[PDB]
């Protein structure tokens, strides 16, 4: 009963949750064993034998979210803000029998803090599946164009 538009709608809404600080609801979109992966190099093979910027399991996602609530998260005084602009997700793999779906989504991501602002462009790969009648992510991979460049602090979730 999953449609291609439900898959697209999922990716659009995931970015909307991040831009509206709905981090607990966002985190619940992942399966408990999923990873949130921001590679360090183009065409990186895996997140186990090569460094990444982020390769976060559920514990690490929760740690980062809870830390943003702390009155002593000095690096978020004042809080950063973000914005995602998405190109329509493209469905690369649609396997209802195998309960497996893969989307490819271009993005422009902006993060600002006070009077400072940075932007990054890239492509998402979302691996989606149905668990208990609901779509969930088993992997979110964020390929930044300039992942291996000299980057300043990136403090929110792309």
């Amino acid at each position: 009963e999953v449609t291609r538009q439900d898959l697209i709608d999922f990716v659009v809404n995931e970015a909307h949750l991040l831009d509206t600080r709905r981090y607990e609801e966002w985190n619940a979109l992942f399966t408990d064993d999923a990873f949130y992966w921001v590679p360090l190099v183009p065409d990186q093979e895996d997140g186990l034998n090569h460094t990444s910027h982020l390769y976060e399991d559920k514990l690490l996602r929760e740690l980062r979210i809870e830390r943003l609530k702390s009155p002593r998260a000095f690096s978020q005084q004042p809080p950063s803000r973000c914005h995602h602009l998405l190109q329509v997700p493209v469905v690369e793999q649609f396997d209802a029998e195998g309960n497996r779906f893969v989307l490819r989504t271009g993005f422009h991501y902006t993060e600002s803090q006070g009077d400072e602002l940075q932007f990054y462009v890239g492509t998402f790969f979302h691996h989606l599946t149905v668990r208990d009648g609901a779509l969930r992510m088993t992997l979110k991979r964020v390929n930044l164009l300039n992942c291996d460049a000299a980057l300043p602090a990136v403090q929110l979730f792309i």
Partner: protein, 436 residues
Amino acid sequence: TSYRDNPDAIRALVQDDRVHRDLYTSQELFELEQEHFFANTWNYVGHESQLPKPGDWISNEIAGRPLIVARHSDGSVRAMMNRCAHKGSRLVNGPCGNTGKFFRCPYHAWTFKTDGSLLAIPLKTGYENTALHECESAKGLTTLRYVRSHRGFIFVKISDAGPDFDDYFGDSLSSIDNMADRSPEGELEIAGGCLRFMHQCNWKMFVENLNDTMHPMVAHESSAGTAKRMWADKPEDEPKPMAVEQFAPFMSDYKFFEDMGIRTYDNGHSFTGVHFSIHSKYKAIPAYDDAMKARYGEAKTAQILGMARHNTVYYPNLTIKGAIQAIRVVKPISADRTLIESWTFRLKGAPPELLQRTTMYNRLINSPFSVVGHDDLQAYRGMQAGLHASGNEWVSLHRNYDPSELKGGEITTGGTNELPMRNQYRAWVQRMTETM
């Protein structure tokens, strides 16, 4: 003040137990560091595994000079200016490559051997009755005399001033030996990528932080306290997530950090953790322990694995962490800009789990996405801004100051002592002023 050609004003910035804020904020002093301090010191430029075969090269920059570090045909490492003898073009573009038997300038194709010497000039008869042969250019590229290696770690010094390599580093190089000895083959190779994190602060704030045991329970409280809260009421020997393992000790009592100890060296080197650790079964990798014994024997394996130096500073531009095979390179850009490049090594012959742990550490602590990195960068930017205040213009370095320390030499001291920072600026003043 005008610090150029003014060594007395430079000396006045550094007292025995405090330094003036202009060390951190003055662009003029940054410019003078390129001419004096960074040119008169030994600086890490790369690892031999990055240029193992003849013709291999990497590019780098030290003290504002663009360099080539290259493997010559005799197997040695040579360093030279990435600056053509004709009109100054870089001979090589990008971070690394292999040039075969000679460099070739990509503007007019003068060629140079891999030791820098001039090889050929197109249409050489155009110089026949000219003074070119009388100029430095006729030699080829400017080459560095002061190029040395220790266990694959390559260092250079631009100028003729300052201590030579062996005296500059003394026994601090033993930290490098320990990291390489942790390979069952005694060899390291660069692997796993480079995290490149731009910091909007002076290089000195990053380097001081490496010896700063009073900051973690403050600057990392939100990160560490959060980690501790998600690992509550667990057996002490239950394997921890690495984030919990690494973050939670930031909140240790001051006594823990005091007891850890610091060793300082002449010329500003240091390491934290002066004790030997007993190798336990906690998170042991049997195949690795077996491979170590097979190579080194039981007694030497215990010695290698028992060294517990949490970090080592190779002043001014390198720090290493032995037991995790991570290094951080300091690339100063301006008075308020520093790039930190964080690299890792594979332990040759070790099972893949070792590089898995090291690359995980590198991500967790040293990425531009790391919350621990955000924590410390926030502190540095806070000082970078705050130090523009007037009134009190001094940075206090008084903690545990004792004039007996002025003798220098190797000193082992308490872990909260600000000695390594005081020692560093004593070296900085000498290296600054000796060529002024």
